[PDB]
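Proteins fold reproducibly. Take a tokenised chain:

. . .
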Amino acid sequence: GLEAAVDAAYEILLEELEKHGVRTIVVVGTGELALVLALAGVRLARERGVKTIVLVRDAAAAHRLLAALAAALGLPAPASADAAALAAADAALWAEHGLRVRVADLTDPAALRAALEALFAEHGRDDTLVLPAGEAALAALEPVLRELGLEEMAAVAREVYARLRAALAAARALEHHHH
């Protein structure tokens, strides 16, 4: 179920924060692992002051993730995927909970590089853990990081992803809410 998945992801992230001195987590992609990482990020922000930013492919994906986060927090979802509504929801989520949800076209390497570069300008590269939310995101993220010369960051992204993938396969976040 969802709690077991969030707990397992939280434990993995705690191990990485201690291992790498992480101050900021950037999640690239959508789906169940993106939600689980965002929810673990809510706990990590409250308990450790570590901020999390999720980069999703389009405004529709941002609305879907913000709506699931809203439900988890007991808060209203944004009324629509209007950019102004999404930006306002994002600013509120950041101020109150240390989480962001931003739009970046992951099919476009230049757009993903630009979104990462914005986050690196805000949060730096040394203390930032970048994680893909799935296989497709890993395949998009690795070459971009490698082009930027961030080989260690790419290596950690792949290794931590493998552990998260295995943990979520066992935890089954959504098992109770579909056939």
Summary: The longest strand covers residues 51-56. The domain at 2-177 is CATH 3.40.50.1100 (Rossmann fold). The chain has one domain: 2-177. The two ends are 14 Å apart (CA to CA).
